[PDB]
Structure 1
Amino acid sequence: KTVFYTSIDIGSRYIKGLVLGKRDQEWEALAFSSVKSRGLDEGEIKDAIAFKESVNTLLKELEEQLQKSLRSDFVISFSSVSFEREDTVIERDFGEEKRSITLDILSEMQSEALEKLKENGKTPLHIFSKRYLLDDERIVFNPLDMKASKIAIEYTSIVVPLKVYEMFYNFLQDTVKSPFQLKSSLVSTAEGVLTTPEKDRGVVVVNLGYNFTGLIAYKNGVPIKISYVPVGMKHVIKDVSAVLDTSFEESERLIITHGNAVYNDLKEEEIQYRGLDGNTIKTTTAKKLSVIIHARLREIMSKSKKFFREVEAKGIPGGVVLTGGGAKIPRINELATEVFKSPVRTGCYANSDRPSIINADEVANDPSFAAAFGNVFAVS
């Protein structure tokens, strides 16, 4: 039997869809597509009508490719500036009795934790067992099948204000014709591009998103910090449009097709583009475009450099993994290496520890689909 794993990644610019099939442990990419996101500046959906259709267009495209009808459970991730880390510990005392830890005991405890994390108007999207202690002072890597008299588990969780949660939940409930689970797009991205030795030794994931740049760091298998910089790709595009009387659409087209993270060695070859709201065709050079881009990019990083240090107080054995649309700008890793002074690589599903899904060559190598993959594996 082929069990289906549907996944949606709601971004401020694009909504990515993906459907994976597991059969014998035969991960395959049965369907996938991307669509222009609508109805939300970001964080908030300011036009649920426009937004709901964007999600339906995606759903149509997906169902069509599958020559089927999606009725399986969905895993939907979305981006927010309000995601944050929260911990909680849960303990059990079986008295003098020396009970053996089973999966049941572990899920009860994780459930106890989920409840506790639901407070202060926040609600957990991801939970990670951080450490295990059997009857005070015996750190184990896996408590399962071990007999203890007492057990304490510290959990790390990524939470969101239920205010934001409701917003997405309500609208998606009237669009997705099946139950689902919301997830952080930043955490899922990390889960879909990182490697175990990386999540373990220490690594920083820098998502070069649209409205902002997301920051998340892992150490010892779980995230230890998460934040962002209020500077994203949207700003690089505003910059290009400002310097060149061009429109925002034309600005993005240029960035996507001619942009480069290193301008110093480019040729001054001519590049044409339509002026602001007119046929008036104007012209720039390859180098001038990249000069405008370069500035914005140096800011984004130089600005997220304090995060690098802030976590350094708890790791670059893994360096930085760049993901998101920005990660696709040519030679951006080269710019990042100079700014962060550490090893920099591009994140995508292919360069991860994760299973080598079959028929899935383009999206698995696309940084923009990282989260889509993460959503599925950030579960089972």
Structure 2
Amino acid sequence: TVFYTSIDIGSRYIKGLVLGKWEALAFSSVKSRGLDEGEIKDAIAFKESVNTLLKELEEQLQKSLRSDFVISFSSVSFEREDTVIERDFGEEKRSITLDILSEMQSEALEKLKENGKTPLHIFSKRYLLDDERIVFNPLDMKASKIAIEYTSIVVPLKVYEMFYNFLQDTVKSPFQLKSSLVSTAEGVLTTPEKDRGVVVVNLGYNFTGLIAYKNGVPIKISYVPVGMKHVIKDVSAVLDTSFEESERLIITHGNAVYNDLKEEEIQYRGLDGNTIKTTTAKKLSVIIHARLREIMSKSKKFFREVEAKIPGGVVLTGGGAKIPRINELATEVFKSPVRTGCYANSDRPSIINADEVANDPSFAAAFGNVFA
């Protein structure tokens, strides 16, 4: 029996998941505090938020957290970096062993720790034997020379150290850090999607994350500096209300498509928290639609830069992917197939007791942290 605690640190919500080997033993989402635009700006609040999630997970389990932690976070600074490692055995041929591959990968990882960056994910991209033979798997093959191309997802050391130091002071356990955007993709994509080509659009809070896979590995990673925070801001601005009332309206009555909406008055509070004001579901959706249209139009540039290096279409993830009919809007903007990403619609076996979270695009990274 083996247990995993997976935490996904977002700017608006911190998601937690305990899995046992498959079943879900515990899961929760708590308000994220102290993170402002991917930077920890209040370590005291941040630690409180994390502790609140840990306490809720323990409360559900009725047992102290004894597992390996895998913890993911979002940053605009993740980027793709490649390197090649070679072995030259001389005038004799040698078997390519696990020890040799382990050694070469360890060496790649050490090589990617440079220019102020550090790798969080590494993938073997190409294998070349004896300077001419391309193979899919080098193991047990004999060769005089081997060259392996690796592609990785790296992050600035300063960003890494920020999260690592605070977490090791709060999570009382060994842990590994990952990219939430990479884990999201790993949590939702099918193998054929990752092979033939597919783009994940993660509709997160501060920004919209963008990652493309082809041939089983990430080929491009970027972002648009517009996210659900700006959708909430627009509503607060237009309806003249608080951030939290705006968020309530969007979650409760929002739609990505407004043209066919029935007349429907909806009430909300002013900044004073008492004055009752009224708008319509249609007007609310127009405000949302416009900002969502902006997000997708801007993401199209990425889509086109990838469209040079898309069978699998677009997979939307993150909190924004839950806005009713957003897939319709996306299909119209991207001019390609679009689907909602969640663990359940990946190509993997159902998980006991995961009904509520396996179908939630918000928990994609939490699952992906584990099933990588």
TM-score tier by shorter-chain length is over 0.9
Deviation at 1:137, TM superposition (A): 1.5
Deviation at 1:19, TM superposition (A): 0.8
Maintained 8 Å contact 2:318/2:361: yes
- SS of corresponding position for 1:190: helix
CA distance in structure 2 between the aligned counterparts of 1:67 and 1:108, rounded to whole angstroms: 41
Q: Deviations over 1:315-336 (max 9, x none)?
A: x100000000000000000000
Number of residue equivalences: 372
Maintained 8 Å contact 2:200/2:211: yes
Deviation at 1:278, TM superposition (A): 3.2
CA distance in structure 2 between the aligned counterparts of 1:110 and 1:103, rounded to whole angstroms: 10
- SS of corresponding position for 1:350: helix
Q: Would you say 1:139 and 2:140 are equivalent positions?
A: no
Maintained 8 Å contact 1:323/1:367: yes
Runs of 4+ deviating beyond 4 Å: none
Q: Deviations over 1:109-154 (max 9, x none)?
A: 0000000100010000000000111111211111111111111100
Maintained 8 Å contact 2:73/2:179: yes
CA distance in structure 2 between the aligned counterparts of 1:236 and 1:353, rounded to whole angstroms: 32
Unmatched 5+ stretches in structure 1: none
- SS of corresponding position for 2:355: coil
- SS of corresponding position for 1:279: coil
Maintained 8 Å contact 1:43/1:164: no
CA distance in structure 1 between the aligned counterparts of 2:66 and 2:42, rounded to whole angstroms: 26
Q: Residue 349 of structure 1 aligns with which residue? A: 343
Q: Deviations over 1:163-190 (max 9, x none)?
A: 0001000000011111101100000000
Q: Deviations over 1:31-73 (max 9, x none)?
A: 1101000111122100111000110110111122122111322
Q: Percent identity?
A: 100
Q: TM-score, normalised by structure 1?
A: 0.97
Q: Residue 8 of structure 1 aligns with which residue? A: 7
Maintained 8 Å contact 2:109/2:119: yes
CA distance in structure 2 between the aligned counterparts of 1:359 and 1:109, rounded to whole angstroms: 40
Deviation at 1:291, TM superposition (A): 0.3
- SS of corresponding position for 1:128: strand
Maintained 8 Å contact 1:192/1:354: no
- SS of corresponding position for 1:136: coil
Deviation at 1:104, TM superposition (A): 1.1
Q: Deviations over 1:180-211 (max 9, x none)?
A: 01100000000000000000000000000000
Maintained 8 Å contact 1:323/1:348: yes
Q: TM-score, normalised by structure 2?
A: 0.99
- SS of corresponding position for 1:8: strand
- SS of corresponding position for 1:58: helix
- Alignment root-mean-square deviation, CA: 0.8
Unmatched 5+ stretches in structure 2: none
- SS of corresponding position for 2:278: strand
Maintained 8 Å contact 2:3/2:66: no
CA distance in structure 2 between the aligned counterparts of 1:215 and 1:363, rounded to whole angstroms: 22
- Which range moves more in the overlay, 66-75 or 177-186? 66-75
- SS of corresponding position for 1:170: helix
Deviation at 1:354, TM superposition (A): 2.7
